[PDB]
Design a protein around this ligand. Structure first.
Ligand SMILES: CCCCCCCC/C=C\CCCCCCCC(=O)OC[C@H](O)CO
Ligand SMILES: CCCCCCCC/C=C\CCCCCCCC(=O)OC[C@H](O)CO
Ligand SMILES: CCCCCCCC/C=C\CCCCCCCC(=O)OC[C@H](O)CO
Ligand SMILES: *C/C=C(C)/C=C/C=C(C)/C=C/C1=C(C)CCCC1(C)C
Length: 248
């Protein structure tokens, strides 16, 4: 029961924290002339807050069902959230950087295909006999990982000069202008923050049997913490960076 209660309250912390972040970002856009980036940050957490509210209510509605049933009932809503918010996050980065728009469009397409193929593998769970590993689940997840690494490759290939993997992955304070620091920040969220999701995806793929009770609530805990870190953390990291870029 304690693992169920913890999962339940993490959904609550999620929608409260997303809503508080929305209020913050939406208020702070009144103090800037270029209101688009904070508008986008606010829309991302507002969308996530609405979906977390309903995910919490659905989780509670299935407190007497299996954790597998709780997971298959809730996760499609999480993918709808991912499919709406992650293109907005990519567009916001490309916009603030003033990057090539056609390059930005390709990044958004790769992100969309990443989430969409992942969704196809999620939909295989309800058609799975447990103890078995589903072929299409592994194929869709692999293709989703390919779109993710394709996205990572494009971001890495365009990184500012001097940026190396070890300083990025070890959270070194990197020197440069706002564009360089903003690029390093995005790389860290995509390479480290976004890597939590494929790890969670591995659990319903290969560990749904294996004698373990309640692996699926652990996957919800992993995804919930990932959403909190990736949406609120990236929103506030970029807000602080743009605030410090002012030359006036
Ligand atoms: C508010 C939700 C936004 C996301 C909705 C789901 C994503 C649909 C397509 C994504 C691929 C990228 C399409 C990029 C289209 C760019 C159009 C353009 O020209 O922008 C300037
Ligand atoms: C109730 C839930 C609260 C959850 C809160 C947990 C706090 C962090 C814990 C785990 C995240 C570890 C991985 C973090 C990966 C992203 C971090 C990142 O990208 O940092 C960039 C830096 O801030 C700019 O350069
Ligand atoms: C190389 C790839 C590594 C990827 C790592 C992915 C994340 C793994 C994390 C949690 C899964 C935990 C699953 C636990 C399954 C074993 C539990 C168990 O054996 O329970 C026995 C039962 O009590 C009587 O048979
Ligand atoms: C706000 C929500 C965010 C940033 C969600 C990000 C989700 C991912 C990066 C998901 C990645 C996946 C793979 C790389 C392969 C396995 C399937 C996914 C969809 C979990």
């Amino acid at each position: 029961m304690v693992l169920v209660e913890l999962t339940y309250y993490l959904f609550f912390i999620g929608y409260i924290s997303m809503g508080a972040a929305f209020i913050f970002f939406w208020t702070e856009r009144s103090n800037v002339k270029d209101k688009l980036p904070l508008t986008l940050s606010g829309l991302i957490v507002l969308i996530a807050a609405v979906h977390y509210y309903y995910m919490r209510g659905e989780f509670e509605a299935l407190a007497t069902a299996t954790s597998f049933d709780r997971f298959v009932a809730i996760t499609p809503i999480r993918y709808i959230d991912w499919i709406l918010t992650t293109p907005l996050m990519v567009f916001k980065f490309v916009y603030v950087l003033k990057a090539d728009r056609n390059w930005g469009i390709k990044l958004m397409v790769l992100d969309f295909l990443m989430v969409l193929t992942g969704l196809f593998g999620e939909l295989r769970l309800a058609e799975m006999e447990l103890g078995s590993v589903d072929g299409m689940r592994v194929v869709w997840g692999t293709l989703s990982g390919i779109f993710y690494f394709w996205l990572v490759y494009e971001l890495w290939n365009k990184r500012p000069e001097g940026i190396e993997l070890a300083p990025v992955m070890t959270f070194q304070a990197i020197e440069g202008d706002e564009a360089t620091k903003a690029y390093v920040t995005l790389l860290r969220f995509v390479l480290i923050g976004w890597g939590i999701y494929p790890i969670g995806y591995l659990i319903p793929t290969y560990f749904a049997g294996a004698g373990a009770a309640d692996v699926f609530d652990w996957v919800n805990i992993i995804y919930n913490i990932g959403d909190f870190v990736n949406k609120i953390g990236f929103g506030f990291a970029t807000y602080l960076l743009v605030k410090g870029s002012e030359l006036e």
